[PDB]
């Protein structure tokens, strides 16, 4: 969807310790948003193990059942190499898959 | 007696306007008792600046303190409307 967080004050400069400030939040309707503010000084000691949207997709992609950029050796390979199984009443079926992870990256 | 002169008017008007705010200073200062520390910190500082400027009768300091003291007042007025 989309989630943006900008300054409510559509004007002015830098605030002063103790001063209030409007905080605009542009997100999807019906969505719940959890917030958190941290002093940048903390990240100077440690910036690892954070939470990023990019790190999320990186995990989703790793859990993909497809193990080939495309195509295959044969018709039964195209489906399997794309994360699918074909089976017909004529006999044409795909290669039996019985292993969770993708092929061990054999360079 | 007739009338004032060049620096005789503007310098007196600013003094009166600055005094009007200083009168209700204790009013606003005591109004921050329920508000945050920010308002209590800003008004106790902007308070002296208005007093010292008044006795000095310096056009610059009086004006400099007039808006200094006027701003904090308005910030307090708005700080109360969120509380009813």
UniProtKB/Swiss-Prot annotation, chain A:
Changing residue 32 to W: In AHUS5; leads to impaired binding to the regulator CD46/MCP and resistance to cleavage by factor I. Disulfide bonds join 67-102. It comes from the Eukaryota. Coiled coil: none annotated. Acts as a chemoattractant for neutrophils in chronic inflammation. This is C3-beta-c. The chain holds residues 561 to 667 of 1663 of the full protein.
From Swiss-Prot, chain B:
It comes from the Bacteria. Involved in countering the first line of host defense mechanisms. Efficiently inhibits opsonization, phagocytosis and killing of S.aureus by human neutrophils. Acts by binding and stabilizing human C3 convertases (C4b2a and C3bBb), leading to their inactivation. The convertases are no longer able to cleave complement C3, therefore preventing further C3b deposition on the bacterial surface and phagocytosis of the bacterium. Also prevents C5a-induced neutrophil responses. The chain holds residues 33 to 116 of 116 of the full protein. This is Staphylococcal complement inhibitor. Belongs to the SCIN family. One of its GO terms (cellular component) is extracellular region. Residues 30-47 are annotated as: Essential for activity. Keywords: Secreted, Signal, Virulence. It is found in: Secreted.
């Amino acid at each position: 969807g989309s989630l943006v967080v900008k300054s409510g004050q559509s004007e002015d400069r830098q605030p002063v310790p103790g001063q209030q400030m409007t905080l605009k939040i542009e997100g999807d309707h019906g969505a719940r948003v959890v917030l958190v503010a941290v002093d940048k000084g903390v990240f100077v000691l440690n910036k690892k193990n954070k939470l990023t949207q990019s790190k999320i997709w990186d995990v989703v992609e790793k859990a993909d059942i497809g193990c080939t950029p495309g195509s295959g050796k044969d018709y039964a390979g195209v489906f399997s190499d794309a994360g699918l199984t074909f089976t017909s009443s004529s006999g044409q079926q795909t290669a039996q898959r019985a292993e969770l992870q993708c092929p061990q990256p054999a360079a | 007696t007739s009338l004032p002169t060049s620096n005789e008017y503007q310098n007196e008007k600013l003094a009166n306007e600055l005094k009007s705010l200083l009168d209700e200073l204790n009013v606003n200062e005591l109004a921050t008792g329920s508000l945050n520390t920010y308002y209590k910190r800003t008004i106790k500082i902007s308070g002296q600046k208005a007093m010292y400027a008044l006795k000095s009768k310096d056009f610059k300091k009086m004006s400099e303190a007039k808006y200094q003291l006027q701003k904090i007042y308005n910030e307090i007025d708005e700080a109360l409307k969120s509380k009813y």
